[PDB]
Design a binder for these strands. Sequence first.
RNA 1: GAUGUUAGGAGGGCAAAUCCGCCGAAUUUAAGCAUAUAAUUAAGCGGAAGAAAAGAAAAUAACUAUGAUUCCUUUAGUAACG
RNA 2: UGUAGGAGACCGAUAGCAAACAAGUACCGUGAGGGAAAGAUGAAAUAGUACUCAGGAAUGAGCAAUUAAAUAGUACCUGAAA
RNA 3: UCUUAACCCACUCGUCUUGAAACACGGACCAAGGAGUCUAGCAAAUGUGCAAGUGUAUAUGAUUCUUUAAACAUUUUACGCA
RNA 4: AUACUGACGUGCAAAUCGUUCAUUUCAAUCACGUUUAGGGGCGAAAGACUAAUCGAAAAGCCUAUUAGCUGGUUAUUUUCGA
RNA 5: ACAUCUCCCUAGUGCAGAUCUUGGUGGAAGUAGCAACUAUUCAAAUGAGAACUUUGAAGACUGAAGUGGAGAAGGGUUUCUUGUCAACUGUGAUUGAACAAGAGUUAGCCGCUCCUAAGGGAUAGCUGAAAAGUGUUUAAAGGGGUCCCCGUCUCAAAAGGGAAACAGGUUGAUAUUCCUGUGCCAAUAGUAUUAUGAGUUAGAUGGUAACAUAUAUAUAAAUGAACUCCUUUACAUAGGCUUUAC
RNA 6: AAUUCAAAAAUUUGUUUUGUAGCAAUAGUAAUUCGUAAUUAUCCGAAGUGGUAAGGACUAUCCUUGAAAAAAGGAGGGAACGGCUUUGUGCUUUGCUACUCUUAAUACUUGUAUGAGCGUACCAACAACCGCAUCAGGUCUCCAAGGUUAACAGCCUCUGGUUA
RNA 7: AGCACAGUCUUAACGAUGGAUGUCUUGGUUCCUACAGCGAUGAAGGCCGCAGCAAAAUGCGAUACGCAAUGAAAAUUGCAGUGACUGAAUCAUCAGAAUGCUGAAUGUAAACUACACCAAUUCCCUGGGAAUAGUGGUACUCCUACAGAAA
Lengths: 43, 99, 50, 89, 119
Amino acid sequence: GSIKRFRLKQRLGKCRRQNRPVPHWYRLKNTKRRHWRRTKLGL
Amino acid sequence: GRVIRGQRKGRGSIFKSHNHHRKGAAKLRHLDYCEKKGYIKGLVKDIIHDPGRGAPLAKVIFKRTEKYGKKEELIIASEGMFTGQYISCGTKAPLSVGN
Amino acid sequence: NKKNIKKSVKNLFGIECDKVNVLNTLNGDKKAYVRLSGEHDALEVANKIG
Amino acid sequence: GKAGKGTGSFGKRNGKTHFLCLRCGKRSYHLQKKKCASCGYPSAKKRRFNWSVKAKRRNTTGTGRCRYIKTLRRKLKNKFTEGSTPKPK
Amino acid sequence: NVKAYELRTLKKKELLDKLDELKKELSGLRISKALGNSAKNSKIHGVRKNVARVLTVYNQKRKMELRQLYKNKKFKPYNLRKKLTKNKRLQLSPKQKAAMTLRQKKKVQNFPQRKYLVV
RNA sequence: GAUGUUAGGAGGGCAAAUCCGCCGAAUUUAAGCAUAUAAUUAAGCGGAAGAAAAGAAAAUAACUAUGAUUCCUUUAGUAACG
RNA sequence: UGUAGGAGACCGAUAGCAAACAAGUACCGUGAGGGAAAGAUGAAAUAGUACUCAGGAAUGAGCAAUUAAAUAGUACCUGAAA
RNA sequence: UCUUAACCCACUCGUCUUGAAACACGGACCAAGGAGUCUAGCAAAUGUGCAAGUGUAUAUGAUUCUUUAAACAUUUUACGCA
RNA sequence: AUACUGACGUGCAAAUCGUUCAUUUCAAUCACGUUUAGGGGCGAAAGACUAAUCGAAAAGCCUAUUAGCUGGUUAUUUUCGA
RNA sequence: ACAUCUCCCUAGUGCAGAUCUUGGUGGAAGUAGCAACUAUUCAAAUGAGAACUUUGAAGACUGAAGUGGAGAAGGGUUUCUUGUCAACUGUGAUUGAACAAGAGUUAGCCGCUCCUAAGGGAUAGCUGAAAAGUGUUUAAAGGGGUCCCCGUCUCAAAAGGGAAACAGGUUGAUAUUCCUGUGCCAAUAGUAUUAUGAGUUAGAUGGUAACAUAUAUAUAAAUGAACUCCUUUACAUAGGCUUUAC
RNA sequence: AAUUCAAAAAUUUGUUUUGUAGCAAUAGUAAUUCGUAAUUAUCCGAAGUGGUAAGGACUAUCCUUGAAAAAAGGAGGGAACGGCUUUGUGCUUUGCUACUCUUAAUACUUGUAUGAGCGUACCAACAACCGCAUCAGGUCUCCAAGGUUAACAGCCUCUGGUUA
RNA sequence: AGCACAGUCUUAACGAUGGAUGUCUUGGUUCCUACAGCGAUGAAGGCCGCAGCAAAAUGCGAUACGCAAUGAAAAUUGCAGUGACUGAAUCAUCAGAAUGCUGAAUGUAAACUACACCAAUUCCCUGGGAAUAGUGGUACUCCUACAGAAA
């Protein structure tokens, strides 16, 4: 919707933040990854 | 079997009375000294309809017997009574319609 | 909250604030638009802070 | 007709009947009667049962952070007197 | 970069002033980071750990000062009393637990259990 | 008996393997099933401890008598119930 | 049971704790809940594929090249059958 | 050894079934997994020790204490069965 | 949702498509909020409906329930054999 | 790393089958099939490569009961710019709701926020082993006046009630929200000054009446307690008629 | 309305001139030039149809009569009532006349004396939802152009959208 | 620069496909031994955070992949930085100090960062000077004490 409650909005942001792929320099020293369309957050 | 149709009607779920537009209960002016020892005269200000029953309800005003000013009750209306009629209540009240 | 930002900005920089608008971003950070008063002119003060 | 019990009727789903739940974080706070399926929320008690072994193991002590219990461990073995320090170098 | 023991001697005003100064520096490092600069990005870690050290010294100093004020008195604030277990706190004092009725005391005094040997 | 943001304190919840109170089935067995059986079990609900409960004779014996409680070995698949 | 030790005529990755791996995770369910798969280069990657040639690019080839071994090339042990 | 030939012979296995090559059922293929066990109590058989006895129970005792959570030991009416 | 027993019927869909058709100011339709829960609810009553689940919902446990019945039930040689 | 046949202890010990389990794999097979929704063509650009990327030109369709604007539930960064093509985008694909890198959501006035309704959850009791079931049923219970008077608490509307905002402009992506203009609404403490008008030498006038009257930078100001009595808030359906706006 | 002139009262009626009534043209839009931002010119005289929406006044219908409060307002009532100075115990008697209201501004003290927090992207299905998915399914509300016409039907057209 | 029919079937060698087999094993397992309760002094649990470059897992809590102190003790490194010549870098120990919002959750609430009421509150300086709308308190039941109200 247009509207949200603040906890819900913050959580949606948290999930979005969680998605972000593994940092490229780290690999020089993933398996779990939300994709929006076919894999709903549900919460 | 299962619970029969008659039994279900009682059980306090959906079959509760259709409250919403009812105007409040019809019950006479409660007993006191002023009525018991005499008469009190009141004013019928209005006759109003009721979604539950065929009889109309009668809006009756008294003036309070121990405090200043007017207090309103709801009496059930006798036939042939009218708005602006004086209604009298009590031991000494005269035999006349709607007293 | 807006009041705290306005006080804070005046303490931290030479800025005086005409109106402060705020919003909560998706990322979890607050974004405050602080509209400057004509008491000073933003460009120099901005240049000094960065 | 065209609202039919299978696919037509599945289309008509709108409005979750559970939300987040403060005490569980598991999306099972039933909105209409204000109550959590997975903890009973306004009730004080947790809402365990002995029938669900699986439910107990997926939310028992030691699954979580253990923010005070962890710190207390080792204390028994050391048995230091309270508020004391080791003597300086 | 600075180390705890050098801090511990210092007056409280000076200690607080130093903390405020480090905070301002830390803010400056962040402002640099927010801009396109990369150059001093490593230095912020040092400053922050130093900030933490300064805070630890001041809080500890206050705690000692507060305990020193609330010597004796039988009525410290709850926080400064023992942080032993709830089960321990509820429990009897050993002195109380030990104590015994006078006749029992008389009995123990008269007939103590004793050490003895045999042929 | 009320009343008090009066002064000092306490209880609530989590955790259960062992532990203590309740409350309480049925699948089952009987080649069916109704009493019995499953079982003073499972589920339900309350409460503790490093162990708990029990405990200092309104006991057993019928002997040359024993002698708080618990547990083991046993009596014993017996007396007995059905 | 929780936690810490010690063990074994126990299992050996389709087994054994469901779970040797970022497992009560991913994933599914309105929900109570249900609930996985997936270990192995080499002695050493502080040996992880330089260089040339053909390619738009993937890639390929080499008179070129790490290794004892690359038909060990990151699908990395062995490598059966269909 | 394998390979085709050639003469002669030769029906889908498993399966329940009086009687299956069956117009009975199960089997597309392959790989790995995959089913008469363990305890209790009883019996006979047979082995083994002792023999009107037998078993050393629980337990105690030991310069027994990696193995050993086993072995060893048991002052001239305990109990089982006989 | 009547008829075409039309299209599709390894669908465009675990009930869809075309044409035909019934319904439109009221015993009218919709939204959202709200109420009632499993031998229970609800039913202008079909044993209908209660999230693709209904002559007794869904979930887990008692529970590896139970089955005089079906299927399966794994190397060789040798001897006697219903 | 492996044996043990010298002897012998020990076992989750030997498979073709269980519509077995699990994992893999064929013939069927380059087949069934990729059929709704009127339909596309020419030239140019980009690029390794264009029937389905972009641009122009045609031809067409949707046809204000719209594939147009807005919005609700649900989704949740899907938005935008810049990259860009491992996989996906059931044909192709330089496209893209995919992937990568950054970026974006600004309110006293629009909402929520406040009120109560169908109702919910609690307090007093009382039951009940408890869990719970009930909601004033034996209440010393929450507020208002200044010792008197009212009197369950609390949640329940993003479409009921409801203090106040509009126009133009502006960005890659927001705007009744930013910018410019213009307003409006709500607060606006005590004390002292000032200025604004009233009334007074403790409360104005007019009007026969229905009723009217403060135009001060501002219509500010027209004594009033307890206690009362109203009203607005605030309401169905049908049918026509009429007025204004677009 | 302001203004003008003519006829008035110790401040009116008649006639003229203005202003898109202020907001308002500086803002929009269609044009027109010159730089390569700047100017100029335009922006208004009559009327009909009745498609929408609101209102008004109503009439009829009902064995159906069509929420509540928060909040606000009005009235009845008549409690309370100069200021300053002062003897005596808020009260009493003496002496004096600029006082009581009320907006707005200002200054000073009083915690820092004006506007809290939260929502605001985008889709809303044609690919962003649900239906195991880019699924011919299902999913709430407002806006409603021209011709034909009883017609918000059906046919074709403009705005806008598309040519998948 | 010639020759082979094709298909179908079978055979062998060399391959693909696949992950069985064998070999491992920082895991499981069972038994034995040992201790063994946390909480209004705010737990378990959940959220929300926190890194120079940082997603999860891990760790930790606005001092935030760690602070102090003690014992080891020279490096730590993917880049960047920071370090010795021993309270500096790294571990381990872990008692001091610190421990967001919640959650029994306890001021009223709850799909709310909504709402009360009473204290204004805090720091520095040796009795003063500064800050800040910030910070505390205020559940239900009970017990001992006390209080002023009633018989």
